[PDB]
Amino acid sequence: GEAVFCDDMSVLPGELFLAVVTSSKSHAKIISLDASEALASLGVVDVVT
Amino acid sequence: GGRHPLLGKYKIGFMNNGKIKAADIQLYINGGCTPDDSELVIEYALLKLENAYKIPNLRVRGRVCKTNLPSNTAFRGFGFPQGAFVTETCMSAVAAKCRLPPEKVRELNMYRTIDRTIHNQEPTNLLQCWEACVENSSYYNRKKAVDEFNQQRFWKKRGIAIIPMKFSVGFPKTFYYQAAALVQIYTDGSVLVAHGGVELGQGINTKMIQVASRELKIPMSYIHLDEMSTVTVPNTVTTGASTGADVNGRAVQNACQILMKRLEPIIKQNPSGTWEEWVKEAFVQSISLSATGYFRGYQADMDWEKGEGDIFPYFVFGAACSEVEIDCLTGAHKNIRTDIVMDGSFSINPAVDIGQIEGAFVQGLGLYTLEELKYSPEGVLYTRGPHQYKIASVTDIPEEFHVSLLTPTPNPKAIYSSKGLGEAGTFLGCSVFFAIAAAVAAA
Amino acid sequence: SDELIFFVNGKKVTERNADPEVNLLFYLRKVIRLTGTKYGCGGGDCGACTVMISRYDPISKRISHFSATACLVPICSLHGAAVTTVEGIGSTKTRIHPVQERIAKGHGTQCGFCTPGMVMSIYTLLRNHPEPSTEQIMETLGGNLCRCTGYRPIVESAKSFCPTKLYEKKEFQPLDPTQELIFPPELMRMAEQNTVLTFRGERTTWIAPGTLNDLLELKMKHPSAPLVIGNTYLGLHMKDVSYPIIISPARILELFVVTNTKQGLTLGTGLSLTQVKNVLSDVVSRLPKEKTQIYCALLKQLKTLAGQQIRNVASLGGHIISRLPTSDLNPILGIGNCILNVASTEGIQQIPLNDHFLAGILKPEQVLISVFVPRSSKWEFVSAFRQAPRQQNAFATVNAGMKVVFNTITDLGILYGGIGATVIKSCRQLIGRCWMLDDAGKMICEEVSLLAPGGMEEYRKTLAISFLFMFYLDVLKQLKTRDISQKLLHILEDFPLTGMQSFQDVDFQQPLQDPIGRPIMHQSGIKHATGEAVFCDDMSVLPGELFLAVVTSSKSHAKIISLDASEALASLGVVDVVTARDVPGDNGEESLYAQDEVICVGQIVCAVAADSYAHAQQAAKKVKIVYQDIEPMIVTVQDALQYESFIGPERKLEQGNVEEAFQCADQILEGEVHLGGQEHFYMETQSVRVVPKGEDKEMDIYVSSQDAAFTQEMVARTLGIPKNRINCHVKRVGGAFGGKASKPGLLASVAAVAAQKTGRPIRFILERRDDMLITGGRHPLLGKYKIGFMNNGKIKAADIQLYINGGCTPDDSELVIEYALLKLENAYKIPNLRVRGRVCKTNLPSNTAFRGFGFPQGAFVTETCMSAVAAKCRPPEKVRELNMYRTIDRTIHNQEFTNLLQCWEACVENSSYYNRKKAVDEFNQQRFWKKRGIAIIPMKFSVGFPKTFYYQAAALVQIYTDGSVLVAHGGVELGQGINTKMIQVASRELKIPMSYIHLDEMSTVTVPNTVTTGASTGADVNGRAVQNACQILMKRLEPIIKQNPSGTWEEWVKEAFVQSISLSATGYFRGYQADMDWEKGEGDIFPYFVFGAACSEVEIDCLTGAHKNIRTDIVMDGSFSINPAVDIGQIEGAFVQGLGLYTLEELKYSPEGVLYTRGPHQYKIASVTDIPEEFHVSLLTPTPNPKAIYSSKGLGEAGTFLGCSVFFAIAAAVAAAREERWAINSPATAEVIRMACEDQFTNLVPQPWSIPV
Ligand SMILES: Cc1cc2nc3c(=O)[nH]c(=O)nc-3n(C[C@H](O)[C@H](O)[C@H](O)COP(=O)(O)OP(=O)(O)OC[C@H]3O[C@@H](n4cnc5c(N)ncnc54)[C@H](O)[C@@H]3O)c2cc1C
Ligand SMILES: Nc1nc2c(c(=O)[nH]1)N[C@H]1C(S)=C(S)[C@@H](COP(=O)(O)O)O[C@H]1N2
Ligand SMILES: Nc1nc2c(c(=O)[nH]1)N[C@H]1C(S)=C(S)[C@@H](COP(=O)(O)O)O[C@H]1N2
């Protein structure tokens, strides 16, 4: 367990963790994209589009 | 995404003795919603689907039909396990219609003399692997026991299958083959290697050390490798097409040679000294101990309009004989024995390569027997995870698994007459498929 | 309560767990992680940590903006204020501020470590006065220190803010004062109820009350608790005292009161010293001059006391209660019959501030609420006096306070500072005496003689009287002016407070985008001004990363009987204590960790690795170890000669026959000169971080060094692992000047092993006081000479003998003495010359390289002969151009091949030497108690290591397929701009714009087996390596630029790749041929020579010994500089280091060789007001030097020796003094000079703490 893979690296002060929301539809226009709840959620720093 | 599903449409004109005279085969593959490596897949599946067989009159067409599914990309075998499987579905189909034995129909249409691929590129120890496989497996003896078993058993049946294989390796353009290295020698005698390949578990890093050990003639332990980085080797190419260590092997070899030649005068004034004394004196005498290597790549080119060209530097020949027992009542089956002969030709690391074959064989196995992806009418992925996506476990692989490399043989093109076996094993899994297929028939 | 609330850069910081001990500077860097503002000491002396604090006064409605030292600012005192750091006013990520721009493009920046503090010392000034005068610019800068640039390019950039070429002034952005950050309104509402705030730490609780009742209450309940406002005292004194309770009277209004009414001025305790300044100027200006005698005395003292930062925080109260022995304000406050208004929980009270209030007088339970200082009666006079190593920002050697009331003497009183352990009959005898001096001189002389550390008694007593005189005349003047030789009248005129850089331009035909010869700004220049440059310490702390502290030998030479650290290991958050038995392999001819004995008074004996540096500092101080002194003990070189203790053999150089030439010589001269040592004083103290990559013993090391390779092996040999396991990185260094060559390799190893046993990353950063102790500096040098000369000045023979104190380990010593000997001849042909030198070793810290590497030391002795001989004969420059080289000639080691004369000639012109010397001579005829001197010194320097392989160098240049290039070489950026140059080079040979090219760092991963960045050859050797990499590559694109000869660099590379042409290439330089054979005493070492010369001029104050540097001119052969702006900076800077070595900088040791002067507070480097206020530099017309790349010439160390022009400028003043009424020792300080000029006063007492080494 001494082999450091990618995730095994220490977290740096300030290092952030990423999660992505994906299309639940096969082929579709995107009428509305509201993330207002997200940005406010606990310990979120930014939503990127 | 993953490997490209593939629908095959074929017409086989054959003679009554099994020899196939003509084949008009048509391939399509679901590429998903973006190009990615798709187009190169269908190019490749087409080039290689002929496999080990000379069909004197053969037309094959293929197009990448795109859909609203996630974007598909490369996968061990890159189009060959997909396209080859269709041509094998003809040899057993024809053998069926004839009522002739499968391996009989297979060694009728298999290459004999020096010949040419469907793209006009041009010896053959393919037969050797086949022959050796026919022996090491005792194919004819066991097929007998199988036949008997089928006469004793009704609600249960067995099947045995032996499949030939002519695979090949490498990208379809010269510049895709280039590779680099930067080898460093510090004044304490320790060496730091660094190249363009990337360790994925197939042991590139290990090999480059083996190489560095030859050309510097110091023990592997003097040599060390940190990582791959764009700081040390600029403008590199993906680690793929089973050529990883062929190309980098050459780059690293080039770096070592260049260096050694620089220590030439140093190993003359003290011809019996130690590697350590040499380097210290190199430094004191202003000889540079920083050197970079490079490999322009193997000449390869293809012209799709004329439909002919020389792409692959060499070929990998192999074959496998697998055997199974299916439970006619539930559909389940167990893999009993499997034998594999594969032309490795002076492997650079017998333990590494053998591992490649063993592994790649199982991925092959899962593709044809166990692994399933399923989508709803509107193309949403049902099977998301291990709980629903079943890869082979310890109890799925043939409990008697033998692998053997053909006696070493010249392949002067590649470094040290080696041969990249990375993707090789995959196609040979369909031996378990056609092992199963014959059980069903007998049922 | 409990929640600490303040704003950083307009962002709201709210700290729920505040610790009364953490200061702002730690908070910014370690917790908010704004690494922009940095610490280079901690004494509040260097301003390197300057920030700006803004305060809203709700009662006044005012928004104040003042600068402060963050290292001393307790975050617990920021509640409700705002803080702005360097990355608050601008950054390349958004947009940069005019101040950050003009400082970078104007080249007010080299190493970049001192810059954020300059920016913020200037910004502040703008926020207050957007169109500032110069007197204000000088006030705001008085408190920033720089060791590289010389202050010229910085000052000049500041000056740009009011009403050939190195940069383009016209492209600067304009200042829009209304564009700045807007004081946070949250803080405004917050300032409009009153209730106690209390913060609890690990060891200390901070209580700040909101009413005087509660303050008085806490004092009585906690009479031990100190009252902290400035913390410019508790900050220092505390460091190892810790208080369980601290009180902040800040919020108490009754302590900030100023009532000017009627018969006296009443000042509240809390008023800062800035606030006292402004209030005392407002009052003195609206009052008659008979009533303001003492206000103008305080004013006179306040103007030079510390810098702006410190006066902005230091309190009137704090200043008084702490009664420093050398306080400048106390000695006058007390001689004016001032009054302290104190209040305890019992009641009001007033105690006088009299001569003995400064005992060895407030009760423990009372607080100072304000001081009453009365207007001056019509017939009384008061006067302040002062003497300091530098005009401002440094304590008085001795200061005085004096008063009289009449011309018969009705009353009298005098308070001194700098002699008694505190501020200390003779005046009482003088009541009724007419205005008596000669009498009072004898009286004061015996008196002060009766009433410590510091040494130099003679000088301190001489000043004490010298101020008597000054007071004598100061008052006789007001007496004649109310109802007197001119030669006397001068002494009452004090010295106030203090160029064109020229080069040949670049060829008309040379394209814009070829940057060679072009004054390109230091590529990191802007980043230096924005605080984006990541130095070593600026790196984030990794989870688990540990901090290192080391305990060092407090004895010079001793066995180590017992070493007990049991308390340590147990102390809070310590993870391990590492000793000599923890070194896995080799431990060092010098040892990382002391074994058995200790051989020097700074040797590290062990190290403790805690989870915080504070936890490691306060643990290491509780390690116990006992010594058994080992007599024999060797410190002075004069010792190491008796005990015949040396390093390496004697080295001798001879030409001609000195024994025979001595008889045919008209005159003979014998004597000796001593030279002081010197501390590098890089602003970035030694720093390293060791970080296990967690596998195969591999590890990254980010170190502040001049030699990363050395470090590399020094660690792999300590741990016993292959070089290939440790990758050593260095992106930049905050200064070096040689002191980071050997040392960091050792200190890295010390930490390397701590990382072994702990099994984790170790961060090892030395505080300055330790840095000055552990790492040593330049080799002091004693000179013994015999000069046979003729009556006309021509020197026929010289038998000169050098020794240098090398310390307790070899290091680079032996190479120093070799070098000092080779170069000491300088510009002079002494037809018969013998010179010998040996490195005598002692029990002092190990000395190492320093800019000039032996030449400023040895050259100074030969110059001491030219002026000695000139003296015996009765003009200096005449004797100098008699013995100067003429034709093609040979050095004392037989090497051959002169536009030295040109520099001299040109210097004789550009300075108008002969015209000014005339004015000087006249001045000396007009002036007695003051004298001037002028001096012009030639110089033949040279460069490079003494063996061919030492010159090699490498590079690895990379070209990606988008056209961008990544360079990497063996040199290391220390602020002299190697990195910048290598880009200029890469630009020539690839013929792409600099902007296409980029350089990351130096690393042993990319360029193996490198040599230290030294001997002034850095860019010569690497310049060649990088050139070689580019060429090799271009040649490979040859066919590609033919098939498309008119294409774009971008299309070329893409096609190179597609056609299998390698874009990865390495360069190499075998080095310049150099060899030396010490037995035959001859060889060719240096590839070329650097010729130059300087003319400086000064005015010394015969009464105090002080002096100001008036003008200085420098001509130096640069010969097609590669970057006129870079080189000129080198010369300007290196000149000032030279200056400090010969005039200001002092190291002092006790008889047993312990280092007295540990830090900025005691170690004085040149500040803005020390350098010659008129400073001109010019490179001689370009001239072929085909050996070096592009006919360039390394000017790194050049300027240093040329400082002694100020030395010999001073030396001639002294003579002219003594004449109307030798061989001077290197540091010619206020002491030495004052004594040199002997008068009625110096004849009163004749003559330990310090021994010159
Ligand atoms: C770089 C530097 C240069 C300097 N140069 C000079 C110089 O040239 N000449 C010179 O004379 N001085 C000089 N000083 C000294 C400086 O003036 C003092 O540090 C300052 O006056 C003390 O104020 P403070 O509030 O910081 O004291 P603090 O550190 O806050 O504390 C002073 C002491 O007095 C007590 N105290 C504080 N306030 C009160 C109160 N209201 N009532 C009762 N007790 C109180 C505290 O308990 C504490 O023990 C220098 C200082 C520095 C850092
Ligand atoms: N363990 C392991 N083996 C592996 C792979 C991998 O990802 N992991 N990739 C396969 C594929 S798709 C390729 S192209 C080859 C690459 O072999 P080379 O890098 O030696 O050319 O490794 C093969 N074997
Ligand atoms: N700003 C700055 N100037 C400096 C130094 C430094 O570290 N910073 N080092 C000095 C010393 S001792 C040397 S040897 C040279 C090194 O520069 P080079 O590599 O161009 O010779 O810069 C000199 N001037």
Ligand code: MOS
């Ligand atoms: O050689 Mo520079 O470190 S005195």
Ligand code: FES
């Ligand atoms: S760090 Fe605050 S002045 Fe040196």
Ligand code: FES
């Ligand atoms: S630039 Fe000011 S210290 Fe280097």
Ligand code: NA
């Ligand atoms: Na695709």
Ligand code: NA
């Ligand atoms: Na030494």
